[PDB]
A paper describes a structure:
The alanine:glyoxylate aminotransferase 1 (AGT1) gene (At2G13360) of Arabidopsis encodes a multifunctional class IV aminotransferase protein that catalyzes transamination reactions using l-serine, l-alanine, and l-asparagine as amino donors and glyoxylate, pyruvate, and hydroxypyruvate as amino acceptors. The tertiary structure of Arabidopsis AGT1 is characteristic of the subgroup IV class of PLP-containing enzymes. A prior study of Arabidopsis AGT1 demonstrated that the active enzyme exists as a dimer. The reaction mechanism of human AGT1 has been described in detail, and because the catalytic residues are conserved in Arabidopsis AGT1, this protein likely has the same mechanism.
Here we describe the structure of AGT1 from Arabidopsis thaliana, solved using X-ray crystallography at a resolution of 2.1 Å, and highlight the molecular determinants of its substrate specificity. The results described herein are for the AGT1 crystals grown in the presence of l-serine and are valid for both structures unless explicitly mentioned. Molecules from each crystal form were almost identical; root mean square distance between α-carbon atoms was 0.10 Å for 798 α-carbons. In the AGT1 structure crystallized in the presence of l-serine, a pyridoxamine phosphate (PMP) molecule and no internal aldimine bond were expected, but the geometry and close distance of the PMP amino group (N4A) to the Lys201 NZ suggested that the cofactor should best be modeled as PLP. l-Serine molecule (magenta) was modeled in AGT1 guided by the difference density in (A). The l-serine hydroxyl group is within hydrogen-bonding distance of Tyr35′, Arg36′, and a water molecule. The Tyr260′ aromatic ring may sterically clash with the hydroxyl of l-serine. Indeed, these two residues are highly conserved among a wide range of known and putative plant serine:glyoxylate amino transferases. Data for both crystals were collected at room temperature.
Numbering used by the authors:
A (entry chain A), B (entry chain A), C (entry chain B), D (entry chain B): 3 to 401
The structure:
Amino acid sequence: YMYGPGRHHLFVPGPVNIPEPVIRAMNRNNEDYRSPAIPALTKTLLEDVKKIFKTTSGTPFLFPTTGTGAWESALTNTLSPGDRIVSFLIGQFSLLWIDQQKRLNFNVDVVESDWGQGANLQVLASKLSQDENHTIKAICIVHNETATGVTNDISAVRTLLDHYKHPALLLVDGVSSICALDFRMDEWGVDVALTGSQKALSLPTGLGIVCASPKALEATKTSKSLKVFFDWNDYLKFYKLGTYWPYTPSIQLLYGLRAALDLIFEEGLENIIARHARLGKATRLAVEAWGLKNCTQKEEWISNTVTAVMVPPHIDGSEIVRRAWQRYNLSLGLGLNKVAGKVFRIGHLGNVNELQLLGCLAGVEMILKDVGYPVVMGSGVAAASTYLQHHIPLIPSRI
Amino acid sequence: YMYGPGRHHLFVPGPVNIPEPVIRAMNRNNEDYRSPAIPALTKTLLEDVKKIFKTTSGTPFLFPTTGTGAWESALTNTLSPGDRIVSFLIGQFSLLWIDQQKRLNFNVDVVESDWGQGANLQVLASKLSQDENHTIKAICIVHNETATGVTNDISAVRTLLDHYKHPALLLVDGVSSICALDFRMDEWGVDVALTGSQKALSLPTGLGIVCASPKALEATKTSKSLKVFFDWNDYLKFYKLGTYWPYTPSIQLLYGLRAALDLIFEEGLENIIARHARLGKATRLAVEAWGLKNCTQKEEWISNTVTAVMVPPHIDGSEIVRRAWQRYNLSLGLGLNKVAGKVFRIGHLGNVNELQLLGCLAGVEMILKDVGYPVVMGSGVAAASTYLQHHIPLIPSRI
Amino acid sequence: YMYGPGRHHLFVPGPVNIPEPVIRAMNRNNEDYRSPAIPALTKTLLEDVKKIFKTTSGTPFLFPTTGTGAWESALTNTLSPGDRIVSFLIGQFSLLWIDQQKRLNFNVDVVESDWGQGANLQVLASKLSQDENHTIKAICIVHNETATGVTNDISAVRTLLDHYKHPALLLVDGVSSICALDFRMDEWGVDVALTGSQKALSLPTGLGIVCASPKALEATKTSKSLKVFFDWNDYLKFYKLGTYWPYTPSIQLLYGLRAALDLIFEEGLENIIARHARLGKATRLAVEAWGLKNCTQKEEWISNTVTAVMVPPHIDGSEIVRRAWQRYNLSLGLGLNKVAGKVFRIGHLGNVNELQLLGCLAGVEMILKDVGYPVVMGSGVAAASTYLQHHIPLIPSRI
Amino acid sequence: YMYGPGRHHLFVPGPVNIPEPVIRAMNRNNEDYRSPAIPALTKTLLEDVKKIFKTTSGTPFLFPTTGTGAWESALTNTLSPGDRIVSFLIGQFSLLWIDQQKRLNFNVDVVESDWGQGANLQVLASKLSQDENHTIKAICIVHNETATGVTNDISAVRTLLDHYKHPALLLVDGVSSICALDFRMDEWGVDVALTGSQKALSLPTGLGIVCASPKALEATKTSKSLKVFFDWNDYLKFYKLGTYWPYTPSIQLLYGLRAALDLIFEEGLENIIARHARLGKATRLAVEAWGLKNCTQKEEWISNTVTAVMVPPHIDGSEIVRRAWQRYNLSLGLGLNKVAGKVFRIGHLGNVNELQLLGCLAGVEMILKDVGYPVVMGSGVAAASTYLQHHIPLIPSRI
Ligand SMILES: Cc1ncc(COP(=O)(O)O)c(C=O)c1O
Ligand SMILES: Cc1ncc(COP(=O)(O)O)c(C=O)c1O
Ligand SMILES: Cc1ncc(COP(=O)(O)O)c(C=O)c1O
Ligand SMILES: Cc1ncc(COP(=O)(O)O)c(C=O)c1O
């Protein structure tokens, strides 16, 4: 281990902090997954998970995998090799999903934007209006691009598909959005939505949570992609049998998810969404007070789960990250690929409160001084805390 | 929860009991997987994992998946669709691997044996001697068939491949054997060996541990199967970069594996193998004293990780399992598919000692009476404990 | 630290096995004991603790101490130096309490019996009959002598006090009885009852739980023993203030006690008492099958929380304890003081089930063979199992 | 129980934050305290505890008690009723110790100062000069008064005792100093030093750690105070027997203390003292920037483990504590007794780092605005950060 004094400040956008009640719930020996207790628990998880996607008709699947594995399940259950997909390259994780799509032998129409911009829906509109024969089988879009702090407008994608009477499936990566930003599966007509357990759900890595619409389930009948581990049909077979698991799940993660959902419902999903909004706004006010720039190029794309901070050209963003780890016991997110060295990222998602964030922001001011950037000490902390003092609600449990 | 008094007796062959030191090691918040601590830890895990496979030249991969996902990785990295495989159907898990092989569009030559028998190597010999053009690309064989308690002789498979000068790859499922039975990857010339974390390693579910020979790595160059999540090449890319992880791992499971390996090395792999042998022998002596039958039909196939007990035709093995759970707080393994109702299974693998086993065996005697089978109370416990009293070693830490 | 394979079998009569939900509850950071949460939790603990003493009139105190500290609190709050007490020396822990009584300058009338016998009540009657001037201020009696497996009849003590119309206080050590044997504080007119957390409550050491009748509280007014840390009046002061704690408690033990009481009420106290009666009878049956002798000399004094086993002259009881630790990963109780080397102890209390005990008993058979006693293997297990197969109830949570 | 989002900010001066490796170490079932493992562990604890007291001659005792119980042990082992003691009343905890001294029938010479001042050493000198017949048997002095943030100079007390050639014993409460401020038991000639586990050691409540000089041990021979639970002689008896425990310890706290001492030695005691000096100075700088006043009246008495902050007349200090709990998920210390409503306390001790403190300080700024104090947001954070950016050392484990 590389011990440092006090509690480590985890401000990467995934993995995130795990609440103590959830750590306690996972503190347990293994159990027999074919015992009656594990199906009974699973049944309550499947029902409650629908609530965080805001679906009544969707079917969830709890894969023992990561977000990348959930991606793969969404594609191989609904599509066949050679099928045409439209996807939006706006940063590193949208890029990696497109890399996966190409490697699974789909025909990807790539719509590129500069990093810090959102998906180009004008190009989408143009592609849909020209696609009279309905060759585009799916739209694959990242809701929140974790590399750049850009949130896309999923409802506008649905507006366009309906406008053109176009039957393409809508597959949405909500890995860094679900349970932090608003997500409305049924209202937006999302056919496959996915998230990972180590993001806003505030768990260890290891669940890739997939939720499919009736339309996506219908599509599996014609899907000629190959799948076994990620095949929805095996799960559906075991759902009907009442045992739920075609192979072994993580007992610990199932009890942990139970506790995580209980905390989410106790705080209240809409209160969680408002909490992320306050923390994102607070962070963006601090970045402006420092004189630095948000990577996000227009206010319509702001992300309340991550802020990608751009640094002047003589400052190395990856040196900020290194100094945070070595001196301040603080984990910040690296700039990736195209924005390597030009940004660092402040994650603000999952189970984190305002004083935690303010401690991070104060550390960043010291790091900036350490690398020779002339910040006025306290100016960002003061901008965040002046805003937060107006809006922090009282904790209802304490009256 | 379905609470019962005292400690639950977990005697299914996976998941198994987790030692307390490993539970403690996993009792932790998330950490940044791109921090320097996680690569440094990973490097020591990859080195030590080679020791439990007994390989010096093999390359390990720590997938966040289950044993079924490790299966899929072994096939899709080394083979192409349409390739001819020989595999051995001797029970439920060998059957499920063949189901997977067929579903990934390989041409499977299935060699069937009755449940309770081992792989038919005479048929193998015949297929190899006829295969002058080397159309068989791989042999896929389960080392220990968890459904029936049958262990196959992997060295004999290698003897035959070399005898016929035959270049087929050797893929071995050691899910219920590695770190309990002897496994000699390099001496046996295994090209892909795999295990799961929830078996003898004594962890939660969630790691599918794959170890590949240089020959298997060479084969990825010609593999035209599709893979992304399970693609070895992405791991190898990140191994060379020194960060190791192409996507997020489970932080908790990495520290837990560190603690599990430390305990394995402290007890000593050969002492662990001898401990499983004592417990299996003890169990088989008890079954004979009860007047029941081992499913395993010949002594050459006995399994020191699981004993499948056959019950007379008027006794329902699944009623034994149910009664264990409802009255004795004891988890026993169900008969599966073909042996449903005709067997129940006593798992004896992972971190379990002799008094734990004897408590299970005494419970089974009471259950047998409960269902009207005329056991002589104490006869199986006495047969096991008479044998064990000769062979239990002193605990070295206590002198 | 001195690792052995598998789970350690803890069969000493204190500390006992901690249920896993209680381990989870205690898995937490410190909290501010002056914050509103700790008084609110404490109030519920005080109410529910009364139910395990079976009192409605009594006042409980949760001292951060051990059983010996609860002893000391019991004495110094109700008595003055020079006060005459009657106490019963029947074993090591009744002896230690008398040693403490003498060192606190009380005038102790010691009624002695051989180890393996109960309190001599005909001597008590004679003392009460002769004490016309009520110089006897208290009877101090151990309910269950953990060193010998002897349980005294507290109801019979009250009968004698009432028969002679004698006002003495009745102080009762129930450290190894309460929440395992029946205990009726009000029905028996017990004035001070005490237990410790690491016994049948199944917690860590660290709470000395004292419960006082209104008569005992009146006695504090005239008690001139010196006390501060153990003074009930400081607790009562803070009870009235609403904050409950005159100095810092263990946060972890308070939450642990909440969880332990919840498990007790879920199983049901009467069911817990029944479960201890099964375990005790099964152990005594095994001892009889082995041809060994119970230390306890009459049936009326049998203890359902501990069995002290007498060994023949060529056997050293300490060697049995040593062998259990070194070979079998089993903890058994030593013979103490007068019975050192002549006995060993099997503890059967707190959260333990029948298959755990049977594993212990099977292990003891092997140890007896090791040290040269001609036991018939299986004979004690068979006697215990025959009995238990008729009496173990179904687990109500599992239907 | 009263859940709030994110991690709770624990800034009371006891209980303090527990490091995660210590939480993990304590996450364990009970064990037999008479088994060979617990004496072997205890011996290492006794040796290493001496290093935190900076003694080679002293004998430590690990009582299962709180700080108040360590007080009581200190007094009753070295003094007799009627013995004259000199003690210094400067705050709530020095007052409680005097209250205990009087209730144990000692003749207490009370030297009083205003809250916010240190011990009046010129009065002590005058007392020592006048005590020709050495009737003063001991000086009892709190090293750090946790109620006011005042640290006394123990070296100056020893200087006066030696100047007047006076033999009195020197008993020192270091409950909120040891392992945070410097403490030199032998160099200062301290005869009894005591601390509690839930302070800078960063454990749960439940150990009262007492360390006695050879002179204090000689004093037990003539001490006629009554004691059993707290009697050092019973410990010394069991030290010589090799088993160390006269009654049952907390297993979890022993392993927890092992892990806590390991963390202390890894960071380095001198580095821990430096870290507390940084935290204290940063807090006092923030207080000065806010325009508030330190309760401590002279620089020589400043405390690096707690800062008591005085608020203006229109502000109720208790309202600040309440608001911190209800809105900000922050625990701060109440003003006690004489300074109730006039002060609040910021605890800065044990395992806490600079970004944790800065989060607290930023939160206090918001609370001051809430309750109507015209703070300049960022002003205290900026003062603390400017100072800390020059002094935080690099974490040696991370290079
Ligand atoms: C939006 C998004 N999708 C997918 C991924 C990949 O998820 P994982 O690392 O769990 O495979 C990430 C990275 O965490 C992400 O941020
Ligand atoms: C030999 C064998 N291989 C593979 C599997 C499948 O493993 P998992 O359930 O982790 O997917 C099992 C079942 O546990 C097994 O026993
Ligand atoms: C009946 C009885 N009373 C008192 C004690 C002393 O308890 P402790 O070891 O908690 O101080 C014991 C020992 O556990 C005991 O068995
Ligand atoms: C200096 C000092 N001494 C003694 C005590 C009493 O300690 P406890 O609450 O552990 O009994 C305290 C309070 O924590 C204290 O601060």
